[PDB]
Amino acid sequence: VVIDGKGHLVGRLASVVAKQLLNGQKIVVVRAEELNISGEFFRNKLKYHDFLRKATAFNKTRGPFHFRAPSRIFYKALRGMVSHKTARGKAALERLKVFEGIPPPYDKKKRVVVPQALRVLRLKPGRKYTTLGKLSTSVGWKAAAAAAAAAAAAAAAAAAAAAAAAAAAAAAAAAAAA
Amino acid sequence: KYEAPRHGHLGFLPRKRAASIRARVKAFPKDDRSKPVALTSFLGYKAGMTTIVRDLDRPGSKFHKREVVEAVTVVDTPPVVVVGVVGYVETPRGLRSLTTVWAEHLSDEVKRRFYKNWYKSKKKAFTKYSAKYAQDGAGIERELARIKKYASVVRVLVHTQIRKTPLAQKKAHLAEIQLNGGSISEKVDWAREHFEKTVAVDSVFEQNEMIDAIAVTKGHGFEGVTHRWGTKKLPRKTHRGLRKVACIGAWHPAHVMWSVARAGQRGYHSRTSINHKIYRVGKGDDEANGATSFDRTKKTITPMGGFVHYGEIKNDFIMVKGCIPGNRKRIVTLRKSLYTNTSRKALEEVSLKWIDTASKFG
Amino acid sequence: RPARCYRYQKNKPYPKSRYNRAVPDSKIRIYDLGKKKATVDEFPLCVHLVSNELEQLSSEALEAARICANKYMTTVSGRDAFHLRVRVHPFHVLRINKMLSCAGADRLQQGMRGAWGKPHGLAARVDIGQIIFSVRTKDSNKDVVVEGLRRARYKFPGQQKIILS
RNA sequence: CCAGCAUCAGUUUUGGUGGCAGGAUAAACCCAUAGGAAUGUAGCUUGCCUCGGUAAGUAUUAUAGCCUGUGGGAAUACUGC
RNA sequence: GGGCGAAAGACUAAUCGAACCAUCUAGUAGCUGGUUCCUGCCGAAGUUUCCCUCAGGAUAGCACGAAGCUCGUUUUAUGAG
RNA sequence: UAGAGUUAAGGUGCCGGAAUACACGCUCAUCAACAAAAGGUGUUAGUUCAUCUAGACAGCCGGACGGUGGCCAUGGAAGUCGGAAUCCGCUAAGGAGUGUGUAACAACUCACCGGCCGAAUGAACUAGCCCUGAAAAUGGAUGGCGCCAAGCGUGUUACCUAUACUCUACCGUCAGGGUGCCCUGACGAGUAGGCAGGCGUGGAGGUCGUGACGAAGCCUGACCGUAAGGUCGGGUCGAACGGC
RNA sequence: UCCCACUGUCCCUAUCUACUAUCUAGCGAAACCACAGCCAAGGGAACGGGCUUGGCAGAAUCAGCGGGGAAAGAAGACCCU
RNA sequence: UGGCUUGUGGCAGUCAAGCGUUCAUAGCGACAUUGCUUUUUGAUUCUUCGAUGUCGGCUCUUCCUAUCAUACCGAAGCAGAAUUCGGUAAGCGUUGGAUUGUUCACCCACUAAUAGGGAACGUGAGCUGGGUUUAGACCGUCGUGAGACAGGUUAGUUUUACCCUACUGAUGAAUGUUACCGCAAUAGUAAUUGAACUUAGUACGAGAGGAACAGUUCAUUCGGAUAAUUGGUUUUUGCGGCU
Structure with missing residues (x-):
């Protein structure tokens, strides 16, 4: 089942995705960088899972491999839920691939239709909190056009809907004018 | 789990053989955003050196503008011939073209080369040397290539012309070479006049920039820890441990990483040396050498005699103050420098005062 | 042994004058201090430093608190x-x-x-x-x-x- | 031949839903009437300062706390159907 | 237990501080190790008086096996921190 | 020894089955995840009291007076050292003084107190959430993803939950009533150890029965069910071996 | 030990040479038989590739090199009966 | 030996009265304690006899900062400058000799100057075997004695080819094929300081003295590049002497 990882928290999306992947259902998450992890920029700085001290230079020869990009976070994160250990686990992992950007131009389950939780309201809650598409910058994340442009790609998808789309709309409108 | 200090360079790992005789360099020196059309690298052959008796570049020196003895590799640069200017653009996958624009007439040494006719290796299929391919219709649509918006750095597949340098073979040495220039549009437009047949030497190399001296070095031996890293001997020098070393691993943990002081291949990659400052360019015959003394040996530019193991130079050379890898006979690939450190000392020529000419030997 | 390690007591009692092969010397200098005279006479107010715990206050710290407060109460x-x-x-x-x-x-x-x-x-x-x-x-x-x-x-x-x- | 498991028809045991009732009791989802204590909102009038409001009268516009007297309501802990 | 010494028990068939070969001899080991069907009935103990006595064992504590039979819940007091 | 019927100890955002639930609340720091002496304008509540239109309190704004250098420590002491008297003054305020300053004068500021303003402010006392005190070496290293509620208290509700609990039957020895044995009580995790019962080889008093028209054996298949291992059947043998 | 001349031991390493390694033919050893072969954190017969979670780990093949597992081996050298 | 505690104790917070010109904290600190901690220095037979081989150094394979020096900042009872003290912050640099087995102990010549802690202190199938578990012989000291000693001296065994893994080089094969090479989603890397020309005789001062800040060059040292004017080797190929 195709969802969209856009404008809410990261963990309270990851959890919901795991129970859906469980059997073998082919859930792909689209966008990782427009999620939101919490923490400061002080404690959540030095020991953080991009490049600063820990999880980039975090390897041996026969040993780990992490990331320094806001795209690769959600991919690594959902081995860290559904492990490679069990047979269904490694099978369920392959049912998920995460994408940067929004390559589908169409509107699937995205903003209005999504599961519960997700879109937390910060009022009395929340002074400090990060964003994955801020945190990964001076970590080796460049090349914004390449990844950031993806937004530009998602735009052309919208465009395809808005067409023909625009046509059936103009019609639908004339229908009610009547 | 201790450490002893860094004797030798760690990051030449793995110490892989540079199979192809010409050096390659994935991270090319980026654009001359000044010169409207250039190339990124060029071509050379390692020949020999002379002592350039000149005067200093640094003008405020204590002994400013004195006599200065200096090294110089006088490498022969015959110009390269184009097969086709490949119009690399983008697609939404990646770095993918659309068409190339061929040259009509190639060289002569295209006979034997375009194949992979060697034992225990793959072929190619029957993509031999050129018939008369896409250039007529292809030349106009490289204008439309920048109109895509999906557009990248346009490059050009080249081959050498050999015998002209004293090496007599007529099977050419291949490489692609990137076109540089002002913008993406300019390295396409002015490169249309490049694919005609042969390019210029002077487009990439302006006199008195810097030139980074990458080439293919010699494979020394299966060099042990003494020469390959830089361990000593033990002064007792008996038993087993003469030219050996101590620690490779560590107790806790048993599993270490790729720092360890073992034996294997030394040199022989496409290893890059930094900003060797270009002296002069001379087209024909200018400087000479040959002096009857011990200095360093066996590479003599127009003495009484010639060079040993090369042949006597009657071509078109570029003079790099410094050096470039290989030894005699070896074909080199001179890349240009992206970060040019010092100010360009061009316009006028650099001084040649006097130089010797005699035998090199007795 | 700091007085962190002179806190509690699995050291059980042992204190008589009959049954003892001689004690060492103490630090303790004086008991009542300031006034000798007035217990509750001049002083209807007191503060007791009442224990929460069942500790041994070692003779090391016993003199210490008392002598700090001795030297202090000379200014007034x-x-x-x-x-x-x-x-x-x-x-x-x-x-x-x-x-x-x-x-x-x-x-x-x-x-x-x-x-x-x-x-x-x-x-x-x-x-x-x-x-x-x-x-x-x-x-x-x-x-x-x-x-x-x-x-x-x-x-x-x-x-x-x-x-x- | 024991356990899983067996056509087709009728019935027990145990618990609940839903409808209804007894023990035993009357608060309520919300139930009358008379006299006395109380004091909230709308509208009107009067007084005083100021451009914005406030005090007093208002049982004589409309409505109430809490007690006393009289009269009338009242499905459920448990237990069964 | 002799041969032998300026000494080192060096020396004597690779064995010499008592040569080697064969027999009595399968000497002996208060110590250690190894050790062959199944189910059912049914199944404890690591405690003691005591020892020229200590990785043991006479006796006692506790349940083996077999035949014949065997509680207490709690009420009145009495003795002792 | 098995499937149901019911639930403990304890769980429901997710790896990995079950609330992204309901009601009220401090707090949102990722608190949750050690630590004392000793300490704090985060932030909330209760109780008592100074204080208040009899003009609370802050800021801004003043009067800094006459006696007078009051008196006295002392080399000197000066409001401005130490110690006591404890006022007058002008009776809508200035004490014989809140703080600074020079050996000190020389110089300066003000509670006490004055003048604008006009409403709830402030000390204690008690309780809670926070907050300060807290350093060490292989790759997260006080959770993987991470959570600002998916934290925690208090009150409530729904879902999940031990061969026990529990239904009924079946397996083991033995008792009683009455043989043949059946009804049927109480218990049945298990090592030493004893008893009972069952399967076991070589051999044999016995020995007839089976055999060359095909014996033991070799090899292979079927192959009852209490753990023990044995009968039948097929290809084949060329003499051996069991009823009782 | 001082004193005189001095020294590849070292500073300072380079170069050339003999023989082999690489590679090949033939015949043909040696004591020699654990399922298995990642690392960081955690529990623990107490310092785990092997067990709990998480990160990581493909096969055909040869030349190399001294860090672990702890090799080639004898029932430890300390230590007590 | 490993575990445990921190005994024996180290460090800091710090009760802060004293005493330094006045003056609890420029500084010095009676009297000592609380938390942390594992270094002086050891309490304990918990866990170990078909191996639990020692010290100082050579050589080569890590991580942290309880911080010597390099970047950045602030304060004094500090006149510039000498002197005195504290915070942000681990990428890099951190000498040469003599006494002594020897770091300890203890001294000198410089130099920009010469840190702290753990990691089976990489660490005897790489290495020395001076330091370090037996066996010639002697003295002191003790016991009737053979001989002994919490005292010293003289000579006196480092064997061999890494099974599996760490692991450094070189080849062979997987969405038609494919000689030839560019993106940078990622992996490995490189590193320092002084003097001199010169700033400036300027700031500021009693006197010795002489700051901010520029432009310019180069010397120690490392790696990669290194084959000409250097220094040498070159059995290949030629030249001198003796039986």
């Missing part, structure tokens, strides 16, 4: 309007082990066998309800011992609860 007067006491004594002789060592020693000195804590120190017991540093101090104006009970409980292990008496 060397017989000002307080009455800092010592109460419960080192009756019990504090048994402390070592020189000890099992094998590979002079004569062998044991520890386990040779369980007798060979008498080194002296300590008082200052159990629940009990105090040493009773400070009968004056009604109006110059009360000085509220301050001087930070300086009392510092040179004392444990967390004593300050009660107005």
Whole structure:
């Protein structure tokens, strides 16, 4: 089942995705960088899972491999839920691939239709909190056009809907004018 | 789990053989955003050196503008011939073209080369040397290539012309070479006049920039820890441990990483040396050498005699103050420098005062 | 042994004049201080530094708190309007082990066998309800011992609860 | 031949839903009437300062607390159907 | 237990501080190790008086096996911190 | 020894089955995840009291007076050292003084107190959430993803939950009533150890029965069910071996 | 030990040479037989590739080199009966 | 030996009265304690006899900062400058000799100057075997004695080819094929300081003295590049002497 990882928290999306992947259902998450992890920029700085001290230079020869990009976070994160250990686990992992950007131009389950939780309201809650598409910058994340442009790609998808789309709309409108 | 200090360079790992005789360099020196059309690298052959008796570049020196003895590799640069200017653009996958624009007439040494006719290796299929391919219709649509918006750095597949340098073979040495220039549009437009047949030497190399001296070095031996890293001997020098070393691993943990002081291949990659400052360019015959003394040996530019193991130079050379890898006979690939450190000392020529000419030997 | 390690007591009592092969010397200089005379006479106010705990206040720290407060209470007067006491004594002789060592020693000195804590120190017991540093101090104006009970409980292990008496 | 498991028709045991009732009791989802204590909102009038409001009268516009007297309501802990 | 010494028990068929070969001899080991069907009935103990006595064992504590038979819940007091 | 019927100890955002639930609340720091002496304008509540239109309190704004250098420590002491008297003054305020300053004068500021303003402010005392005190070496290293509620208290509700609990039957020895044995009580995790019962080889008093028209054996298949291992059947043998 | 001349031991390493390694033919050893072969954190017969979670780990093949597992081996050298 | 505690104790917070010109904290600190901690220095037979081989150094294979020096900042009872003290912050640099087995102990010549802690202190199938578990012989000291000693001296065994893994080089094969090479989603890397020309005789001062800040060059040292004017080797190929 195709969802969209856009404008809410990261963990309270990851959890919901795991129970859906469980059997073998082919859930792909689209966008990782427009999620939101919490923490400061002080404690959540030095020991953080991009490049600063820990999880980039975090390897041996026969040993780990992490990331320094806001795209690769959600991919690594959902081995860290559904492990490679069990047979269904490694099978369920392959049912998920995460994408940067929004390559589908169409509107699937995205903003209005999504599961519960997700879109937390910060009022009395929340002074400090990060964003994955801020945190990964001076970590080796460049090349914004390449990844950031993806937004530009998602735009052309919208465009395809808005067409023909625009046509059936103009019609639908004339229908009610009547 | 201790450490002893860094004797030798760690990051030449793995110490892989540079199979192809010409050096390659994935991270090319980026654009001359000044010169409207250039190339990124060029071509050379390692020949020999002379002592350039000149005067200093640094003008405020204590002994400013004195006599200065200096090294110089006088490498022969015959110009390269184009097969086709490949119009690399983008697609939404990646770095993918659309068409190339061929040259009509190639060289002569295209006979034997375009194949992979060697034992225990793959072929190619029957993509031999050129018939008369896409250039007529292809030349106009490289204008439309920048109109895509999906557009990248346009490059050009080249081959050498050999015998002209004293090496007599007529099977050419291949490489692609990137076109540089002002913008993406300019390295396409002015490169249309490049694919005609042969390019210029002077487009990439302006006199008195810097030139980074990458080439293919010699494979020394299966060099042990003494020469390959830089361990000593033990002064007792008996038993087993003469030219050996101590620690490779560590107790806790048993599993270490790729720092360890073992034996294997030394040199022989496409290893890059930094900003060797270009002296002069001379087209024909200018400087000479040959002096009857011990200095360093066996590479003599127009003495009484010639060079040993090369042949006597009657071509078109570029003079790099410094050096470039290989030894005699070896074909080199001179890349240009992206970060040019010092100010360009061009316009006028650099001084040649006097130089010797005699035998090199007795 | 700091006074962190002179806190509690699995050291059980042992304190009589009949049955003892001689105690060591103590530090203790004086009991009542400031006024000798006035207990509750001039002083209807007191603060007791009442123990929460059942500790041994060792004779090391016992003199310490008392002598800090001795030197302090000279500025106001060397017989000002307080009455800092010592109460419960080192009756019990504090048994402390070592020189000890099992094998590979002079004569062998044991520890386990040779369980007798060979008498080194002296300590008082200052159990629940009990105090040493009773400070009968004056009604109006110059009360000085509220301050001087930070300086009392510092040179004392444990967390004593300050009660107005 | 024991356990899983067996056509087709009728019935027990145990618990609940839903409808209804007894023990035993009357608060309520919300139930009358008379006299006395109380004091909230709308509208009007009068007084005083100021451009914005406030005090007093208002049982004589409309409505109430809490007690006393009289009269009338009242499905459920448990237990069964 | 002799041969032998300026000494080192060096020396004597690779064995010499008592040569080697064969027999009595399968000497002996208070100590250690190894050790062959199944189910059912049914199944404890690591405690003691005591020892020229200590990785043991006479006796006692506790349940083996077999035949014949065997509680207490709690009420009145009495003795002792 | 097995499937149901019911639930403990304890769980429900997710790896990995079950609330992204309901009601009220401090707090949102990722608190949750050690630590004392000793300490704090985060932030909330209760109780008592100074204080208040009899003009609370802050800021801004003043009067800094006459006696007078009051008196006295002392080499000197000066409001401005130590110690006591404790006022007058002008009776809508200035004490014989809140703080600074020079050996000190020389110089300066002000609670006390004055003048604008006009409403709830402030000390204690008690309780809670926070907050300060807290350093060490292989790759997250006080959770993987991470959570600001998916934290926690208090009150409530729904879902999940031990061969026990529990239904009924079946397996083991033995008792009683009455043989043949059946009804049927109480218990049945298990090592030493004893008893009972069952399967076991070589051999044999016995020995007839089976055999060359095909014996033991070799090899292979079928192959009852209490753990023990044995009968039948097929290809084949060329003399051996069991009823009782 | 001082003193005189001095020294590849070292500073300072380079170069050339003999023989082999690489590679090949033939015949043909040696004591020699654990399922298995990642690392960081955690529990623990107490310092785990092997067990709990998480990160990581493909096969055909040869030349190399001294860090672990702890090799080639004898029932430890300390230590007590 | 490993575990445990921190005994014996180290460090800091710090009760802060004293005493330094006045003056609890420029500084010095009676009297000592609380938390942390594992270094002086050891309490304990918990866990170990079909191996639990020692010290100082050579050589080569890590991580942290309880911080010597390099970047950045602030304060004094500090006149510039000498002197005195504290915070942000681990990428890099951190000498040469003599006494002594020897770091300890203890001294000198410089130099920009010569840190702290753990990691089976990489660490005897790489290495020395001076330091470090037996066996010639002697003295002191003790016992009737053979002989002994919490005292010293003289000579006196480092064997061999890494099974599996760490692991450094070189080849062979997987979405038609494919000689030839560019993106940078990622992996490995490189590193320092002084003097001199010169700033400036300027700031500021009693006197010795002489700051901010520029432009310019180069010397120690490392790696990669290194084959000409250097220094040498070159059995290949030629030249001198003796039986």
